[PDB]
Amino acid sequence: MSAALPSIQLPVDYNNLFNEITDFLVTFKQDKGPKYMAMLQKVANRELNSVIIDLDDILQYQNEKFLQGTQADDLVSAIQQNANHFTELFCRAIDNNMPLPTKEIDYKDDVLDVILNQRRLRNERMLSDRTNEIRSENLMNDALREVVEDETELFPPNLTRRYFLYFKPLSQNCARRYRISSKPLSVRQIKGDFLGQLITVRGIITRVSDVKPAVEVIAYTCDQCGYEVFQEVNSRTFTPLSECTSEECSQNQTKGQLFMSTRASKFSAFQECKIQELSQQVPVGHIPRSLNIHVNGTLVRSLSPGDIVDVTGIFLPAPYTGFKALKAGLLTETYLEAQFVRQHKKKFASFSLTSDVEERVMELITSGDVYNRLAKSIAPEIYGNLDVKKALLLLLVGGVDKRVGDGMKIRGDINVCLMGDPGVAKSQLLKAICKISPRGVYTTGKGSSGVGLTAAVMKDPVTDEMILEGGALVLADNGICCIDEFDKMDESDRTAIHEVMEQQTISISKAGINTTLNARTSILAAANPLYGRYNPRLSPLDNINLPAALLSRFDILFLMLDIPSRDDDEKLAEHVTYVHMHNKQPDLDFTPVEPSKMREYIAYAKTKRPVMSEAVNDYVVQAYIRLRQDSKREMDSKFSFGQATPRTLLGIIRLSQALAKLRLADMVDIDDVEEALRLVRVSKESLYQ
Template identity: 60%
Template sequence: MTTDIVAESHRSLSCWSWGWKFSRKCILIPQLAPQVAAKSTTVRYLPHPAPNNLQSDSSRTTKSTLPAVVAETNSYPKTEGNQPHSRDRTDSVKMALRQFKAPVAYEAQQSALESFLTDFKASPEQTISHALGNITIDEDDFSDDEVMEDDETRGTRRQARSPPGPKYKVMMQKLADRKIDEVLIDLDDLASFESSLGDELQLVHSIEINTKHYVELMSRAVDKLMPQPSEDVTFKDDVLDVLMERRKQRNDILQRQATEPVDGQLPDPSIAEDKFPAELTRRYTLVFKPRSETPSHPVKALAVREVKGEQLGHLITVRAIATRVSDVKPIVQVSAYTCDRCGCEIFQPVNDKSYGPLTVCPSEDCKTNQAKGQLHPSSRASKFLPFQEVKVQELAEQVPIGQIPRTLTVLCYGTSVRKVNPGDVVDISGIFLPTPYTGFKAMKAGLLTDTYVEAHHIVQHKKAYSEMIVDPALVRRIDQYRQSGQVYELLAKSIAPEIFGHLDVKKALLLLLIGGVTKEVKDGMKIRGDLNICLMGDPGVAKSQLLKYISKVAPRGVYTSGRGSSGVGLTAAVMRDPVTDEMVLEGGALVLADNGICCIDEFDKMDDNDRTAIHEVMEQQTISISKAGISTTLNARTSILAAANPIYGRYNPRISPVENINLPAALLSRFDIIFLLLDSPTRESDAQLAKHVTYVHMHQRHPDIGTDSVVFSPHEVRSYVAQARTYRPVVPASVSEYIGKTYVRMRGQQKRAEKKGEQFTHTTPRTLLGVVRLAQALARLRFSNEVTHDDVDEALRLVEASKESLAAEQAANGRQRLNASSRIYNLVKTLADSGACRADDADDDEEELGVELSLRKVKERVIAKGFTEDQWLAALEEYNELDVWQTAGNVCFVKKKPLGLGVLALTLLRKMKESKEKEEHSGGALASGLAVQSHVSRFYMWPILA
């Protein structure tokens, strides 16, 4: 029987004259060889006649001759009368170059890798560094320091103190005992091992430029050297373990049958091909850790735009910020099928994100019987890996001028998942690989391919407090200052030392980093421990710089601007997941700052609708979402640090502080402290500020701040805060009673301030909780588990210090500042002197007695100067009772004659009674009265003593 295999140009084979061009699908031809040999078929390439040495012959269609057919096409023989054109010959030569074999001794490298895994021992310095890396601060660990140890624990500690053995041999033993599931190969270790062998093999360099291939080589070495378990691990078995054990026994039997005679039969080498795939039997993930920086080998983390095409296949390190992290889902690594006819198990290794499932059984039984059994997927026998897709973006400082940040896709498998959260700044080391587009993108992309990084090693730039490494030297240094009682001042001055002044603000920000204690009542109600602070003030007082610094110091800090943030951008948005094509929630800035700090600049520029999204976060610390069929609650356990300007840009002293702040009372009450920072010009402070700023510009650093010029670095501040957050201080009964009395006094002060129109903020029960949180943060700062009276006093002092700028502004403007009524009187007096705002029907004959002014016009002038209508009415009534002017309808008659001596005596007597020393003031009062009487004789009206 003769079978014609037609190779069309758009499918598998194309012919140009006598030049044969093979496409990618040509690899399918050798797979047809067994069928061709079994049926004694003839292979003929149509439609062109074949050359002489490629004539169809049944002897040349066997399994062994088919690859030779492909190889012989490289010779392109000439036939008589059929000379190929020169252009065809040139194109054929371009497409049919002979195979180039790189001079790489893979067998020698495989042997060297096995020796490395067996013999390498870590240096003492590496052992100490590894031990320090395993020491972490656990915020939730509240057990006592003295714990009774059993024999097993003491044996483990004794073994840890013993001299280290072969590093990777010990690692493989832990792998066999199922204590770990990751094999981390440090290229620094391999480089030191390679230096003892010589540079002939170039193992490290080969791994760095062809990482994907050497992952397989190293995995084979680990499989070969894997020891037996040193302890019973059967209690850890699951369904996959049982299947793996049976498969392992089957592999051993097949291996013996392939190498040794069984029951008098000769060994069959083809049986060895029926072994299970190595990917199915491996219970670990092998990754490479890149080399660290040395003088001979400088290492630089690349920006996203610095990753070029020439680095495809290389091990690279990219520094970026994670913007989106998908859910962890299983991805198939080995797909298993079961045949419904012969019962064979078929395994298909998958090395890409997409694959074509098998449908027809390729086993020999089905081929012999021509059964064409159907394959059914077997999920129990398949092997899956955890998979996560991460989108990273360039850092702001890496983006050139006028450009937008670029993004890169990172694929995490196995142990690399759940190591990156949105908003983290990370160094990701992995293999830079291409991948073809799929779906509709493939139709538009043409020959273009997408790229991604297969993550191997991830380093966090700012670790969480619970993951920070304890440096004993740093702990001793900070503890030394803590015992001296100066650590509170030093840590506060170490926050943004380049910014002049604002010491109390920096102390409050330090307490914001530490936070209070979050408590949960038995019925499920939670009392937040995170602090919320608002910085309200004039432009140019370094509010934004403080926010930027705090967002960088905090392990999880998110900085956003109020004008560029919407309610959805702050909370959560519903988006379509590009991996699964499902509707998912994309967390906003508040969700990204979970267990951290969210800094919101230009807080006053936000729309009211967007600002209401923060109310639930600031108190309940959750975000309730019900949209697009998704109803859920997201955690937003974050501290809010907001910066805002007054209502008219700068603080207006003519209106009350509440009117200047112009924020809803429901939002103001959620802030524990509201700092009012005013830019009041004073000669001394302005000179010091100018000196500080010029020093920073000249020396690129902050000047000495006194106190032995000790300034802690941001890492030291984070380490101290991490240790302080492990304490959970409580409030004793005596301090609780003291806090209650203080709260009652604060409520009384607020009531009196409301009557005077000097109310700064609203004192509510939330204010009481804010004082408790501040006191708990101060106790944590002292490494104490109990709040004292001093902590409460310092918390109250900070609350009062938030209003110091307002008091300084009043003192600077006032020089014994007049009240609103007196300022309105001075304005009306000026109008009367100038003749402005006179009534339309005013009689000039009455000018000797006084001046008639239009109340409507005067009121417009008063309101235009920033006074309220209530202040105008109060001043009008007060001076009407003092007989300074008289009102009738829309006319105000301002008198020229002085007040009677009776009114003067009553006014002076009232002032004298308010003084504590009457005798000393009697002479002064008489002198004041004479001066006032002289003043009245020169002006229209009597100046009122406020």
Template identity: 50%
Template sequence: MANYDKRDYTKEKEKLVDFLSTFYYEADDGGKVFPYADQIQRLANREQVALYINLEDVHTHDPELVDSIQENARRYHALFADAVDQLIRETIGDREPPVRDALDAFIYQRVYMAKQQGKNVDGSLPINDDLRKQYPPQLMRRFEAYFKPRDDIKSMAVRDVKAEHVGKLVTVSGVIIRSTEVKPMTSVITYTCDTCGCETYQPVNGPSFMPAINCPSKDCTESGANGRLHMQVRGSKFVKFQEIRIQELSDHVPVGSIPRSLTVTICGENTRLAAPGDQVDITGVFLPLLKTGFKQMAGGLLSEVFLEAHHIENKNKSDDDELGADEELTDEEAAIVAQPNFYDLLAYSIAPEIYGHTDIKKSLLLALVGGVDKNAVGMKIRGSINVIMMGDPGVAKSQLLTHIDRLATRSQYTTGRGSSGVGLTAAVMRDPLTGELTLEGGALVLADRGICCIDEFDKMMEGDRTAIHEVMEQQTISIAKAGIMTTLNARVSILAAANPAFGRYNPKRSVEQNIQLPAALLSRFDLLWLMQDKPNAENDKRLAEHITYVHMMGHEPEKKGMKPLDMRLIRRYVAMCKRKHPTMPESLTDRIVQMYVELRKDARNNKDTTFTSPRTLLAVVRMSTALARLRLGDAVEQPDVDEAIRLMESSKASLRPDYEAYQKATSPVDQMFAHLRDLLHSLPADDDERAIPMKEAIKKSINKGLGEEVLKECLDVYTSTGILFVDRNDRIVFTMN
């Protein structure tokens, strides 16, 4: 229980002065370090503004003093400020401060004039602190004092802060859901009388105040002049002020309850330390809100409360310090990373309880890492990778999204029907504190430099869906509402999941009829996966065995000796990958150009396919750089491009429902012959010989996953029929076109 006996605060102040001037700790070299004495010297020299008083140090010096501070924080905060004032005066004496501002010049002039009027008989100036005591202490101070909590203090949930905590120092955890602009708040108002010239000072301790009108000086009172007071901005003092609102964490909310929120006021050097979407621990004084005028009658006996912040600790999981991205990998982690199948192991570690979908997991891994942004003069090319998964119900689309949401260092999860265009981009809100119109970012803005997962993408209203077109390509949100015209950054990768237009994919209809999404939107997705639930006895058996194993054992079965990686290790490795900026060498240009030309030709010949645009070419470049990042390389190599092209072709193949049946019905030899015919038609028209170099044919067979053995078998079969032959220059020549 707290000690509520009558205290002598003069002695308490002496304790604080003793702590600030005598507390020390021993350095590594055996010397004594006086942290607070050094900071007070810097405060006196105007080299430092904020003084953070660590309650752990106070506990080491005097354990009982810490309890008093936590029980009566507001009073002890004022005592600490007075103690620092006293020590600063002892440090600098009557010397002028080394750095002077307009307020210093104003006060110095007033003090000098008062001293001149009170000269001694011999003409000397009296040295008297009473002259400075005529001014409010807030006006004279150029420092800020804050309490830093002890290391063993556990943070509280918002709903656990109750009436008994009013006036006490508490630590509350939550997520910032709203933040205002930093504005100047009045600390001390200086008035000048238009009749007698007397100056009056009015300290402001709340969010609102009643300005003084009549002059309270002795001259105006006795003469009955009733002089009017006019505010002097130059002689007044203002401090930085920001108001945020925190909401309790999801794991603090009981079942069936609504998350509670709390208003936090921040002043001075603590402003702009956190942004909306950040998870924070805030230490401050829990206080009731002082209301003036008729507002006192509105709530009756009820009072609004707020937290006056002293210390803000950002606990956001995107913080590199929390991830340990700067730390070196341990020997065990380095051995895991050095495995030749580490790329497959990373993909397997994404939602390992979900059976199959290996290529889709690899594409989600690339979206986590992202490509490299290109900011050329007058043009910006995004590096983030957008992926959409469309498929039948029950194929684990939502499970993949929720796992990525937990795995990503900065992410937002939303659904199509539960999101509006304003909620995704930005909304114009009226600030309850100032009454001004302010801009509040939506899910895409909060997920800046992260991932936004949108489930039930097909259920979104068409007007809301068009709001994200700009975000997916330009990575910005342009706003022109209510007189606010600005551009917000939304450098975000979008992962979307949707069902086909008829609930399930109908193979009797075309791809466009099944998807029913505009081409302008589909072209902005780098990869479009169609996940079908096709009856297959062998696959159904393996899937059922996998699901029953997960339900019985509580974890996924090991696959070929692969064990899923820890989520923290994946986050650290992804953070390390994002620090790399690999470049694309010119030697890989021909390979990418050839791939793009073939895709365009397939789209032209096959009517039942998706729209192929130059954005497809950029998608391959982005995935290639993401793969180079995954192996911590400084340049993109041929295997990176080949894997990116393979994922692109696999994505395109998933959109053709008869593709697998066609592949099974056609032998590898016939497939190789079809690829050779494609190579022949891609030769220049003015080439009379119409011959394919053997090296090109081998490269084609490897890229298509057939191999050199299938090419040799194809040449043997079709040479015997007289359709083609190999000449002396090791070239394949067709006898007929």
């Protein structure tokens, strides 16, 4: 119609793009036979649910067709400009061809399979009945097919699907090889002129909610006519309906009445979260913003709170404005749909493959002297203190927990303090190791309140209700919780830490909580001595503001002295000035291991569980008789530290079991336990000079 709602032409065609997308779907040989008959046959064999259609095979197909002749119609930019029509267009391009019968149905499979099977079979018999009727009423056969295909109501192919479909953006590598769709943007950068494209962000996830079902189509029954009246729901709120809308309970006097059912609808998981700004890509005087994300389908349960993530998705509107008196029409309030999630700091132990990984791991293993090299590698940009780095590698490894069938549980973990002041560069190690380990939270002294690092209760928006929002310690479990300035903590926080020293437990009896939440954390602390520093006139624990019970809960305690000495100063000055002169320290003859390959090594190392033996029983027992024997013949408040509790015995077996894993051997030997006794006797007792 002209003159009201007029027309426009544009260069974009939807005619040959469908044909080209069919040709791409069939003939692609690069990755036995073709690529998508294998994966799509795997889908129809009912062992898979998602389909990843990348944006690299399309571009390589365009350079191949561009060099063969003829000219190929530009399709990649056509996806990148619109990116919403192509899921439905692409998916009805898939459904013409599918290798159906490749395996008979199992009996015990599922319920969604058997529902879609009965819909398909009933659809066939309905389609064959009418051509068994009209064909016997005469009076090439394409015409009779066109007769039957338009006098029969069917289940539409939007409902018999079983899978989902997800894109995947293109690298800088493939765009560099042949010469945009994924430039990593920030949340300030998203102008309001990207609505519809396919973009990429990065930030820290905060406040990820629960997973609860949301409806897509609703299936009623009519009870008299016998139909099944569907209804699609697009909006936030819907409304139920009344008497009927069929073609038999309509045009009659006596309409029926319909009521719903839940084993014939179609559900989908649903979960929303928020991205905060990364706080490194901000201007000078500003505050981090936020931007919502919906998540549908298979991609759910991959957004853990407190991470660094690279979400790529398309960017739609969703209608709302705020107060009614502020509206000007037709303000829209955007969100970000999710398509494919790629994390930095990949989390152990969510990996299985080993074959390609050994090409990098076996280089470190065949490099020779793996252990002291890795001990050199953690935070190389300081000088000195090889023993502290040596112990903190054993913090990052950890292990091994043990259930004894009661079931009372033992740890399983190491707890390390640091002492001395001020210029021994202790904060650099805390930022360092709370940057190497995934799931690592760095909290200062004050700082967090008592309710900041325990959980709290708050009302939840749209999904309901009353979830316990976690604190710092509940966030970082099975990780490392660095702590600055341990002396300035409020005393309630001290009892919280002492409750973490017994395993698993924080207990709350406040105004709305009776729970016992879990925490499997590891604690590294850094306490300062009494003012000013290190008087050998003053006794131990005189210059320490902490009770010796808390000294007993730490199996490993350190102290970093500060004594002026002539010889080390030139090495230290050449070290530091050698890096302000440049940006890399080590030379002659060493290279630092990159941290990603190191996390691959340590992440590989935690799947061993070594087993002790009988000679190490004798050696551990006799060494404990030594330490117990000489530790209690002093009994004074002197530089000696009494009284070598059996937590040192459990801690030294636990350090032996930790050192045995880096040999990757299940071969607990005497160099193991001898190394552990070396770190015990050298660990403390450094205050002699």
